[PDB]
Design an enzyme around this catalytic site. Structure first.
Site, PDB file in Angstrom:
ATOM      1  N   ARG A   1     -12.949  -2.887  -8.580  1.00  0.00           N
ATOM      2  CA  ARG A   1     -11.507  -2.946  -8.628  1.00  0.00           C
ATOM      3  C   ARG A   1     -11.075  -4.309  -8.122  1.00  0.00           C
ATOM      4  O   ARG A   1     -11.413  -4.685  -6.989  1.00  0.00           O
ATOM      5  CB  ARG A   1     -10.913  -1.819  -7.762  1.00  0.00           C
ATOM      6  CG  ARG A   1      -9.462  -1.604  -8.026  1.00  0.00           C
ATOM      7  CD  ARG A   1      -8.896  -0.449  -7.200  1.00  0.00           C
ATOM      8  NE  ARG A   1      -9.470   0.864  -7.486  1.00  0.00           N
ATOM      9  CZ  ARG A   1      -9.147   1.645  -8.509  1.00  0.00           C
ATOM     10  NH1 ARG A   1      -8.258   1.248  -9.420  1.00  0.00           N
ATOM     11  NH2 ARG A   1      -9.735   2.834  -8.630  1.00  0.00           N
TER      12      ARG A   1
ATOM     13  N   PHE B   1      -3.930  -9.484  -4.239  1.00  0.00           N
ATOM     14  CA  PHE B   1      -4.280  -8.512  -3.212  1.00  0.00           C
ATOM     15  C   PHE B   1      -5.754  -8.656  -2.813  1.00  0.00           C
ATOM     16  O   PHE B   1      -6.044  -9.156  -1.724  1.00  0.00           O
ATOM     17  CB  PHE B   1      -3.939  -7.110  -3.754  1.00  0.00           C
ATOM     18  CG  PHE B   1      -4.175  -5.952  -2.801  1.00  0.00           C
ATOM     19  CD1 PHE B   1      -4.547  -6.138  -1.460  1.00  0.00           C
ATOM     20  CD2 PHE B   1      -4.042  -4.625  -3.291  1.00  0.00           C
ATOM     21  CE1 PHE B   1      -4.765  -5.021  -0.623  1.00  0.00           C
ATOM     22  CE2 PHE B   1      -4.247  -3.539  -2.458  1.00  0.00           C
ATOM     23  CZ  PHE B   1      -4.614  -3.750  -1.105  1.00  0.00           C
TER      24      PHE B   1
ATOM     25  N   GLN C   1     -12.415  -5.637  -4.591  1.00  0.00           N
ATOM     26  CA  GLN C   1     -13.007  -4.513  -3.854  1.00  0.00           C
ATOM     27  C   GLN C   1     -14.430  -4.249  -4.337  1.00  0.00           C
ATOM     28  O   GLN C   1     -14.663  -4.117  -5.555  1.00  0.00           O
ATOM     29  CB  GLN C   1     -12.186  -3.243  -4.082  1.00  0.00           C
ATOM     30  CG  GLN C   1     -12.768  -2.009  -3.341  1.00  0.00           C
ATOM     31  CD  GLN C   1     -11.914  -0.762  -3.513  1.00  0.00           C
ATOM     32  OE1 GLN C   1     -10.776  -0.817  -4.000  1.00  0.00           O
ATOM     33  NE2 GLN C   1     -12.477   0.377  -3.125  1.00  0.00           N
TER      34      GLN C   1
ATOM     35  N   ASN D   1     -11.131   1.982   3.022  1.00  0.00           N
ATOM     36  CA  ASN D   1     -11.365   3.313   3.606  1.00  0.00           C
ATOM     37  C   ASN D   1     -10.509   4.360   2.912  1.00  0.00           C
ATOM     38  O   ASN D   1      -9.704   4.043   2.053  1.00  0.00           O
ATOM     39  CB  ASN D   1     -11.074   3.303   5.141  1.00  0.00           C
ATOM     40  CG  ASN D   1      -9.609   2.957   5.474  1.00  0.00           C
ATOM     41  OD1 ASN D   1      -8.703   3.573   4.954  1.00  0.00           O
ATOM     42  ND2 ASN D   1      -9.390   1.948   6.329  1.00  0.00           N
TER      43      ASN D   1
ATOM     44  N   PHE E   1     -12.794  -5.001   1.053  1.00  0.00           N
ATOM     45  CA  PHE E   1     -11.974  -5.931   0.280  1.00  0.00           C
ATOM     46  C   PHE E   1     -12.333  -7.342   0.687  1.00  0.00           C
ATOM     47  O   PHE E   1     -12.420  -7.645   1.888  1.00  0.00           O
ATOM     48  CB  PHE E   1     -10.503  -5.797   0.657  1.00  0.00           C
ATOM     49  CG  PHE E   1      -9.900  -4.423   0.380  1.00  0.00           C
ATOM     50  CD1 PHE E   1     -10.390  -3.611  -0.627  1.00  0.00           C
ATOM     51  CD2 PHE E   1      -8.801  -3.984   1.106  1.00  0.00           C
ATOM     52  CE1 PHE E   1      -9.821  -2.367  -0.920  1.00  0.00           C
ATOM     53  CE2 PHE E   1      -8.209  -2.722   0.828  1.00  0.00           C
ATOM     54  CZ  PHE E   1      -8.717  -1.909  -0.192  1.00  0.00           C
TER      55      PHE E   1
ATOM     56  N   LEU F   1      -1.986  -4.457   5.518  1.00  0.00           N
ATOM     57  CA  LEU F   1      -3.155  -3.656   5.903  1.00  0.00           C
ATOM     58  C   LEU F   1      -3.374  -3.631   7.419  1.00  0.00           C
ATOM     59  O   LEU F   1      -4.225  -2.881   7.904  1.00  0.00           O
ATOM     60  CB  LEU F   1      -4.439  -4.193   5.247  1.00  0.00           C
ATOM     61  CG  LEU F   1      -4.387  -4.353   3.728  1.00  0.00           C
ATOM     62  CD1 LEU F   1      -5.758  -4.906   3.282  1.00  0.00           C
ATOM     63  CD2 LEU F   1      -4.096  -2.994   3.054  1.00  0.00           C
TER      64      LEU F   1
ATOM     65  N   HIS G   1      -6.831  -1.163   8.333  1.00  0.00           N
ATOM     66  CA  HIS G   1      -8.130  -1.603   7.834  1.00  0.00           C
ATOM     67  C   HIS G   1      -8.762  -2.517   8.867  1.00  0.00           C
ATOM     68  O   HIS G   1      -8.096  -3.391   9.403  1.00  0.00           O
ATOM     69  CB  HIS G   1      -7.926  -2.353   6.505  1.00  0.00           C
ATOM     70  CG  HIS G   1      -7.457  -1.448   5.408  1.00  0.00           C
ATOM     71  ND1 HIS G   1      -8.319  -0.911   4.478  1.00  0.00           N
ATOM     72  CD2 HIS G   1      -6.235  -0.924   5.141  1.00  0.00           C
ATOM     73  CE1 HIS G   1      -7.645  -0.100   3.674  1.00  0.00           C
ATOM     74  NE2 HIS G   1      -6.375  -0.092   4.053  1.00  0.00           N
TER      75      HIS G   1
END
Length: 162
Positions: A54, A59, A62, A101, A112, A121, A125
């Site tokens: 992803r 952003f 991942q 997570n 990420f 985040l 995170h």
């Protein structure tokens, strides 16, 4: 003092280059160790051969689902999903490595690589490292991403280690 690990990134099997990361073992030792060991392969499993499934421009990229290759899998080196170690470090800009997570205390193996300052985040995170060399490669990877993260080419970790 902090350890450094690398990924050789490939795009449909063609080499894109090496990204290296500093892992902040001095602040999040358990979280750093998990990523470090998955990068070496020393426990007998880990990131080599896995993909970034992803990628969302603005952003993150991942990765880390080396069991199901699609976000539903991943496992830590600890035999169970593990707690959020701390939120000492914040999401200060592009290149930050932070755990993905499924909510509080569900860290496995997914992460990420941030491609922007992802301050939304913070406190949710665990930040545990940052890109050292190869940020342009991460920017190149980001261009293969799209709206909800579908990638237009297969982006893999061809090799990795310490």
């Amino acid at each position: 003092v902090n350890p450094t690990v690398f990924f050789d990134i490939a795009v449909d099997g063609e080499p894109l280059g090496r990204v290296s990361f500093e892992l902040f073992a001095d602040k999040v030792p358990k979280t750093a160790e998990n990523f470090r060991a998955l990068s070496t392969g020393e426990k007998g499993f880990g990131y080599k051969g896995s993909c970034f499934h992803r990628i969302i421009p603005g952003f993150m990229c991942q990765g880390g689902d080396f069991t199901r290759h699609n976000g539903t899998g991943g496992k830590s080196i600890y035999g169970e999903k593990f707690e959020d170690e701390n939120f000492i470090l914040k999401h200060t800009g592009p290149g930050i490595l932070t755990m993905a997570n499924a909510g509080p205390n569900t860290n496995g193996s997914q992460f990420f690589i941030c491609t922007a300052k992802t301050e939304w985040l913070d406190g949710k995170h665990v930040v545990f490292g940052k890109v050292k060399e190869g940020m342009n490669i991460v920017e190149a990877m980001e261009r293969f991403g799209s709206r909800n993260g579908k990638t237009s080419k297969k982006i893999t970790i061809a090799d990795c280690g310490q």
